[PDB]
Amino acid sequence: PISPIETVPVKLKPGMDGPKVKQWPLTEEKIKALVEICTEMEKEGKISKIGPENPYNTPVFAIKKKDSTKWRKLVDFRELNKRTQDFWEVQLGIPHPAGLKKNKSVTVLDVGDAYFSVPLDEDFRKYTAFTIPSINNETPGIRYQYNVLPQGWKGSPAIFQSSMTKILEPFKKQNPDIVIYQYMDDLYVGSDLEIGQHRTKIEELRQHLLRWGLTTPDKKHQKEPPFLWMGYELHPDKWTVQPIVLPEKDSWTVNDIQKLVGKLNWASQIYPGIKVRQLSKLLRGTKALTEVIPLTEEAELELAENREILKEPVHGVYYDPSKDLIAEIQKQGQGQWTYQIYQEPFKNLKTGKYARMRGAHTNDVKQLTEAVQKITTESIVIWGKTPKFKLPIQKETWETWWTEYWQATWIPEWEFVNTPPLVKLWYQLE
């Protein structure tokens, strides 16, 4: 059904033409799946095949977001966002409720399908062009352009903002002590009431939503060992830590002292004014390694006083919204990895430790991808912005396997680290 509803004119920043992005080659199953999807969406009037007159493009992918049964077509709108929305980050930008982070418990749920009923500006549709890749270039690429609002796109929820707000009010009214943020096809809901009360409160919103429109928060189900049931349930009541942790026992031999000093010297670049000198003095004598040398007098002053500056970090806690967040993860012990988000080096806004149970699927890539995904949500909730990721993985590698374990609707910007840092410790930061 072609809706006679009026659309909002989408014009980007001049001096910036549409995305002409290369479509990554996909697996056979993945292609057929996209074809399936699109063919039905084409009937539905949502998308439309175009001609050569449309030179623009966007990457498409195939995900298994639900619980890994059906395929979700994921669109890499990263460029278009840049290309339009960074000027629609102001024009009709959704503001961030700075306490959502201070909140006790939050939940995330797909609200992507919502935008599908609503139509997309005629003179702009061209920019949504994507291509389904033919295997081995056998046949010409399959080209469609969106006619309605795009899922991945950041401009979509911006337009639907008006509609969404309205469709929220009844719940918002009867339920005041609940925050609701809309970053993309996801709605973040926060509460200070406990689990039981909260889940029933979520089901309420789900019901409410579903009542007030075919806006369908996709089905609740279980998975991992201690069985879950509905939505991605975060808990920012504990979103802070000090992963530093110095050796509370191993400070007896020369090497232990030697190694110690170096980490401390790196810490100097972050926490200013760390006294290492008095401690590094009882080393100078070129003494043998493994020699159990007991710690001196003035040397102990350099530890205990700077071991408490490690448990109380304050300086430029500031966050520049004019600048972007940069999160870099580094591979640590088998199951664990460690992330660090900063906007200007050493000035670390958030520092955490990820760790998936070593046994379930001891896969290297899964782990990272999983990390990034989480690391990202952590950002939105706290800042409403996706970080550029400095990835310790081969470009080509990632570009192959990421889409495999990608259960998210969004895709953050990324980069790849081709350099080994001394930064990796027993418990490391940046």
Next chain:
Amino acid sequence: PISPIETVPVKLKPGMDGPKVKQWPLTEEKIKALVEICTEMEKEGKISKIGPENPYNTPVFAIKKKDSTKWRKLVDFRELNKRTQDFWEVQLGIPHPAGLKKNKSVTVLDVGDAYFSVPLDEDFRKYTAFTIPSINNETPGIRYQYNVLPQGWKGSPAIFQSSMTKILEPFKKQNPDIVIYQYMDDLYVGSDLEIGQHRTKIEELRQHLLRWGLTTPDKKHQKEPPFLWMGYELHPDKWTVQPIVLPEKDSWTVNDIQKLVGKLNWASQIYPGIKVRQLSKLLRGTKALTEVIPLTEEAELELAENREILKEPVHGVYYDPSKDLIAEIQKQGQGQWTYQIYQEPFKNLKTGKYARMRGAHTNDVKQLTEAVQKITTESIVIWGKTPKFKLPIQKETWETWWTEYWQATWIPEWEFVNTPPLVKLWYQLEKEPIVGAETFYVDGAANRETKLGKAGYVTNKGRQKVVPLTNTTNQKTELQAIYLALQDSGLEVNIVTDSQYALGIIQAQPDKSESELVNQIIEQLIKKEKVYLAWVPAHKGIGGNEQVDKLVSAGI
């Protein structure tokens, strides 16, 4: 004959206007030869004389090829191409013969001048305008304008393909099984029907096309069964590139080596083992195509080694999905590795090579995995599938590696295989400090300007030593110091460094580097029983560091 098919809408790059080039006349026999074609091209409707209105010019070249019998012209729309909007990428890559299916009969149709049958958008025609003055320029109104897709123009290919895609659709469905492919002026049709049932269908396609407006004057299959598609030699069950000949000179240039490296690179597809390692290593100098680069004995021993291979024909088999895919890789040394992908053993599907260039000294394993990747990648690009890996690596050496390395990876389904060039980690730097072993506090440095360095050490039991070095770098010194430390030590040793850089390379565990020093160090590492490496800061560091550098400094 003009095709009725719907023409796509074309505009000029925003705020731009079309070409206006009132060309310099030529009263030559060429000017008559022009109208000979035109006032016979308009008869076929390809072009049309337009009125003295606004239509602005585009230069006509009345030329003809070396005695081509049929004097044919051509308008060069160089400036028009500049003005016209952007279209979709036509040459989005070509299909690779490596992943095609076995076809009983294949046909190829000539779609040249079919561009000339497909029509051009009406609100655009005016831009392809051109005039041509004859005798005494007193008859300028010989102004024509294109109605179809102009040869050489920008839209021409992207539109044509689209129109053809459009056109073939009803036909592709009245008989789904038969597949068609198209590119430029070629039409590679193919199916598994008996020759007669097959050859009839072709004439059917031909009439269909001819029913729109396109033409195939070639009575049947005119292109000989062996095909030269993009150089490749195509036959019903095998593929290669028959013309694969590279001449032997004696005093060649960069210009000529580039073509060599390229023709050799081309051959890497089916011909197994081709190495362009030393062959390209030399081109690295600042480009000037006309500069002669004298060959090395290595570069000589590589070409002839390749010539050996390239002298004899070897073909490639086709893809059959029903069968699983498998790829095998093996090391050739000096960074060179080679792969082959097959289904039926020794039924070579395709081959290729990887080499870690420029970025020197790296682990053998990282290479193997970097290799797998290219393959993994290239497989999806072709078969949309990832292959089974047959590779010379002990499962335990891999386990330990990813469990050791910093960067993340994932090698899919793989299995072991034996071949003398086996990949393994020869040594491992000790995790914890060795107890009984001597502690070599080490330091190295150089006067960057003078290039004269001094490398050396000091030990827990005052075993000092400092050795001079000239025409070396500050880093070369840093490594020299370790090698030294290794030499003068026993079987197990503990070595400490001031340079973070120094540390890296050793931890990286490379092998067979062209760097003479690194090899020496490697060998020492392999010879050793245990080696604990430690790192402490360069300047403000003590632990002996507050003496080892005061020991290796002299000059400025």
